Every structure is written in C-alpha cells, then in structure tokens.
C-alpha cells in the first residue's frame, strides 16, 4: 500500500529527528488545527512523547498562538502529529501523520501519473 | 528507500494496465524525449513488450508525433517507459519509469514535508 510505504519514510526521518525539529512539526500542526476550529479552549491528544513536549514548552506555543488554552487529553498510538478537539469533544481535527498522509494520498498519485504519462 | 517504494506502486499499476493505456504512456514519453532531442531520426530502447508495441503501432505514433523515424535498439531491463537516442548514439534521454521516478523524487519529499511541517 502506498500510504503505508510513504509513512515508512516518515518513520525513518523521525528516527534521527531532534526534539527541536520535531517540535516545529508539533507547533505547525497544532496551529493549523487550532486555527480551523477557531475556539478558545481545546484538548490535544497525541503519543506520550508529544504531549510531554507540549506540556514542557507551552509558553513557546502561547507566544505563537495567544488566544488558546490547551488541556492535554489521553495518549494515543500515533507516530506523531496531534489530534485537537473542542473542550466539549464535539468537533475533532485529526492532524496525526497517519491521517495527514491519507489526505495527501492524491499528491502521491499525481506524481505517479507524472511518471507514467508526463 | 522512497524511490523503490513508489516504484512498487507503479509496478502494481502495470500488473493490470491495458495495452491502450500503457501505449498512451509510451507515446507521451517518446514525444517528450523526441521534442528535447529535436532530431528527425532516433533509436529507442526499452523492454521487449514496449519495443514490440512501438513496432506494431508505428503508424499511430507517426499520426500523433509527426514525421519521426524510429529504429528499435537493444532491449533493457526496465519496468517501462523508453530510452531515446540520436541515431549516432551521442545523446540519450532516459525516460524509463525508474529514471523518471528518481527525477520526481523531489515531489514525493515535498508531500512528506507537508505531512510533517504543514
């Protein structure tokens, strides 16, 4: 499967990624989700390492997004990225790497179409 | 490797591809190479299946590509696509799927980068 094969490359890259570079991913995907939801109180779910980073570096996050209050939620089985929901649990944006790769599957197929047909 | 992985998906697509669809790939990649070389006479190398199709459908090739003169060359071990050479062998365009995938590697990495960093 093409999704799983490209996620293997994401896995390889995470193998040597620094905490600081990974946190740039966390911040970017947090901001995207938080901005689309456009609410002042959200809950964030991710793997244990990621939630720990968000907790440790909350002030860095609030400087690039001052309106939001984050509460950590339950830890999940993800390679990385974040799931962000409203405090009440009504709306949820899945910004895990797994979900994001699925959503960008069309870009991979477009490249393959380029290879085959120009 | 990322190139080998995406080529596995190309291989899977070729497992069921009709002759007519594959020949659309052949024509497109021949057209591109012949345009860049800007020569009247060329030599084409590919797997036996592809060279066979070019030989049997030469009239269709000329209808779309114009007044080209193609000579079949030796077979090469490729998944598909074409290698196109000037008659004297001086200049060679590698339009095999293997070579093309390497050349479009950047587009795959851009999709991966988007998954990670937005």
Neighbours of A69 (CB within 10 A): 12
Neighbours of A80 (CB within 10 A): 23
Interface test with B, best of A7, A36, A98, A116 (most B CBs within 10 A): A116
With contacts defined as CB-CB under 8 Å, which chain A residues touch B5?
Answer: 2, 5-6, 8-9
* CA B102-B105-B106 angle, 5° bins: 135
Tokens representing A115 are 């290879």
Find out whether B83 and B76 touch, Cβ atoms under 8 Å: yes
- Residue B100: closest C-alpha in chain A: A115
> Given CB atoms, is B13 within the 8 Å cutoff of chain A?
yes
Resolution (A): 1.9
Q: What is the DSSP letter of B40?
A: S
How far apart, in Å, are the Cα atoms of A33 and each of A14, A69, A87, B105? 21, 13, 14, 28
- Residue A80: closest C-alpha in chain B: B116
Solved how? X-ray
Does the B1-118 domain belong in CATH 3.40.50.80?
A: no
CB contact under 8 A, B115 and A101: yes
Residue among B107, B114, B117 whose CB faces A24 most closely? B117
């Amino acid at each position: 499967e093409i999704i799983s094969s490209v996620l293997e490359e994401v896995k390889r890259r995470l193998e040597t990624m620094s905490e600081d570079e990974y946190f740039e991913s966390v911040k970017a995907l947090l901001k995207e989700a938080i901005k689309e939801l456009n609410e002042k109180k959200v809950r964030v779910m991710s793997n244990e390492k990621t939630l720990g980073l968000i907790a440790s570096r909350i002030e860095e996050i609030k400087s690039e997004l001052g309106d939001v209050s984050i509460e950590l939620g339950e830890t999940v089985d993800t390679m990385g990225g974040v799931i962000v929901e409203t405090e009440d649990g009504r709306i949820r944006i899945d910004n895990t790497f797994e979900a994001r790769m699925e959503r960008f599957e069309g870009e991979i197929r477009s490249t393959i179409a380029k290879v085959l047909f120009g």
